[PDB]
Amino acid sequence: GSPEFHHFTLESSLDTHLKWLSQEQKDELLKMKKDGKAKKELEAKILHYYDELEGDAKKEATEHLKGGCREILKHVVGEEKAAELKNLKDSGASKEELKAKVEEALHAVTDEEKKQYIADFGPACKKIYGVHTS
Prior knowledge:
This protein has helices at residues 23-34, 39-51, 55-76, 78-91, 95-105, 112-120, 122-128. The protein has seven helices and no strands. It comes from Ascaris suum.
């Protein structure tokens, strides 16, 4: 399970979305990904690191993972819908309107590689985009 393309790699985030990771942590993810661990094992380390964070650390990471998943959403749903989601947000769409937007937007795609990210990042992105609620 290696997404060979180097566009949505964890390296691609290390100085951006995932820069809040410590070197030992980064090198941990690198070690796993390099040793042929599944991306979902990376999803699990980072989500663990995420939940174990601190005051501004968590807030910052959350915000950074948002941008990360935003770039994924830039892929899966396209500029089009990610724009509608971003504008909805700015226009005062609540966490639910984004929830009830996002679910239809990420439904209406149905392109295979994109639905990979829907399955991949979708659930975890909900805590990240923390639109989850309750």
